[PDB]
Nucleic acid binder design. Sequence first.
DNA 1: ACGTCCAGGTCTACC
DNA 2: TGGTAGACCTGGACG
DNA 3: ACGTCCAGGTCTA
DNA 4: GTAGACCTGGACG
DNA 5: ACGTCCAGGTCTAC
DNA 6: GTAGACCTGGACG
DNA 7: ACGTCCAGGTCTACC
DNA 8: TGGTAGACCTGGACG
Lengths: 206, 207, 207, 205
Amino acid sequence: MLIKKIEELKNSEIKDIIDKRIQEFKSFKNKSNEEWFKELCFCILTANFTAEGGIRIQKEIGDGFLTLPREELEEKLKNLGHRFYRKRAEYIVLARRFKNIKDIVESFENEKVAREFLVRNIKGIGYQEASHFLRNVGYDDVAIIDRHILRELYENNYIDEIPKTLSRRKYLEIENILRDIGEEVNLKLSELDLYIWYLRTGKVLK
Amino acid sequence: MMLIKKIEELKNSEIKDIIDKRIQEFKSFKNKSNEEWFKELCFCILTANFTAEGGIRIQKEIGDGFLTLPREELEEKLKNLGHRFYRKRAEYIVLARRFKNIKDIVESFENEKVAREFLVRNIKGIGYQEASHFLRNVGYDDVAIIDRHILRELYENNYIDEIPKTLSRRKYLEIENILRDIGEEVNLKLSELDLYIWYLRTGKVLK
Amino acid sequence: MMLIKKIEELKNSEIKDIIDKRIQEFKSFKNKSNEEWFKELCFCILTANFTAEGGIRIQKEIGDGFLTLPREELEEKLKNLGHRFYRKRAEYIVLARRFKNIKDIVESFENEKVAREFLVRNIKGIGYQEASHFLRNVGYDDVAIIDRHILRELYENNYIDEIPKTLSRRKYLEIENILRDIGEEVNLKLSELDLYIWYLRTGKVLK
Amino acid sequence: LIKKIEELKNSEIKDIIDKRIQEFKSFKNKSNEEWFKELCFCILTANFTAEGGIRIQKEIGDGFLTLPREELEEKLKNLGHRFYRKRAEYIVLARRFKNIKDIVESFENEKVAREFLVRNIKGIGYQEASHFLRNVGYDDVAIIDRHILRELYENNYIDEIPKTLSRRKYLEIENILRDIGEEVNLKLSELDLYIWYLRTGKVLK
DNA sequence: ACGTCCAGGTCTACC
DNA sequence: TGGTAGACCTGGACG
DNA sequence: ACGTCCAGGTCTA
DNA sequence: GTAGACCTGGACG
DNA sequence: ACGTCCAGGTCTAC
DNA sequence: GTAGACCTGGACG
DNA sequence: ACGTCCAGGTCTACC
DNA sequence: TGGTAGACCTGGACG
Ligand code: NA
Ligand code: NA
Ligand code: NA
Ligand code: NA
């Protein structure tokens, strides 16, 4: 079933948007360290939150993610109506240790290894949001596994149950099921995601 | 307790001034830039199984080059500067550049002991000996440099029963502890301390 | 990994029988009076910073003396029978006599972990270790005895990064849980598990 | 170190060593057959145990002299000696000097006699030759084995545990000890028992 | 030798 | 609070 | 007189 | 945990 | 447990 | 001057 | 209405 | 350990 649904989206004029988006990421090969970092923050802000809200907050704050004091930045987040302003603001500041994120990430063996580094070395980033970062900046063979695509995987029965938790072991299992699915629909991991996400919500945000 | 006898022997000499101004030299790194810090990390990598002064010279000649120099070029520089392991050390140095702002990364940690834990497992080229070396050099007080010299100095006074071929983190941590006890006894920080014991051996107070 | 290996080969050795005859020696406390249990509780108080062997004869020579002998005479016996702390341990034993029906008090508690909590804050001389040691010695399994020894090899086998100064309740229940997983990876209750781990370093199977 | 030895000359141990040193002197009146059994004992102590060789020397007894090659190798084999084959061979070959007492005594001193033994018997080098001579009553040869050597380096008398204790080694060390000797006022033989006991807490031979 | 090392921790008293 | 330095205290093993 | 031993360890398989 | 690999010039007798 | 540690060196070749 | 060989059997954790 | 639902998780403390 | 509970924390649409 899921296969069928995606097949027709690849046909529908939705495929036209997903690739203005997929390439919207690829262009990060020509973006600055601040931009890349601003994307990392977007991921940190997105966890257990809303994409729309995340987009606003990002555009509204801009390079404030990289110049605002912990107390001043914290307040702005309070303004734009973010669920968790205290915590997420703490992560932003703390993350500045790696403000040259583009150079740090582009220097790893691959993407699977780079993801490993962000998780354990950035408070606020698990596998969900690291995969999200990598993707949003050009990376194809990583999967983002949040509530939604979980739901489409439990629903279409690819997974037994919606895990009370997501160990690294499980994330890499599922991410693979996702990978094998994408060979049939013939999409890289970065693309597929947007497709399943769109089904679920009805928006090719990011 | 002969070592100790020789330690206080030094504390009451014109050597204490040299060491005391040497320690102050490191403590000034609190104001230096990320560059002056990365360039110090490299010096350590250079000094691994090499000459202390041999690494002091190369650091002078290359200077801000540790940041810019490409692989094949920096290799030429080193190869010409007479370093033993030009290829390998050149390799490591370049990789370390992914942390070209090594100050933001180090000061972000809660304590030096944990900061070392990071450096040791994210920078190929750095183990405990040369991270302790690194940190100490940029102004931290509570870490020990457990090289060959201070090792068979300990050993030579029965602080240990053998010179182990390789140092386990548990092994290095245990040895360090041992040094700190001397530290308390003689009243000095593992930073100060290390310059002393090092001097009892070689006769020079470099770094 | 090595520790895991040492264990199972013991489970196949002559030792897998001495420990077993020993484990059911504890379970047989379900059919003993308060006094016999108290005698055990007393044995554990004697063991704090002392020998397991020593506390076994002292309890055998003194027998049911922990219940009748006045302080002065008890301390005297504990002095003659050569106990490290003949005064303090003599005091604890007397104060505990306000629970000389210890069996009725312990079995009353829903379980074991909750009963252990009662022994610790309500009896001088009994900390978390010599509390778990008592319950285990009277037939309880899901509690670990974390003494100088089982600490030595947990640290030697890289399970913990240090031998802590003193064991806090959180640190105890934490390490106790580290042992609890070690248990299921070889299939042994903490009680039985303890004896294997203890025989490794001491080379004996007492209690 | 010297402080420790003084503590020993104080203890009951000093009496234990006096009666032991006098057990060696008795060889002045023992037979060629006896002097040889000690020689064999010393051949069974090289890279082996002092206590092990003792019981072996006691069980085998005069067997070192009358048992055929293969027979002697069996008793050594059974008595759990590390090297039954070789030691039996060394013992058998040495039987050509069965009247070892006559030969040793005929020499000028101990220093020259030991030289003959070493060169003229397979299985015997300096330590064993010294060991031998000490055991029969001779007083100024040092036995340099793993322990008296251990003690000497741990105490900064020598600087390396030489891989190969050369004759030129054995004798520089032997001289050092002889100087450690005047410090405490002991014969090389008495001193060896003192140093050995420190290492081993046993005082046999 | 004589001193060092070491045994299935728990307690008070301090800040 | 809750983490920690000192007190309790002795006999045997071992170089 | 040319050969040996020494220098602030770390990484891979 | 460990040996081989990385690599060189330099002072000593 | 079983694998390493350990014990009063001497010989034979290259 | 120096590896390999001779060769094992108890203790120990 | 206004009490429910829901949104691209991850960290700490605890065992 | 590595899993689990519980915190972080709110707005906006539903009906
Ligand atoms: Na993280
Ligand atoms: Na490293
Ligand atoms: Na208590
Ligand atoms: Na010979």
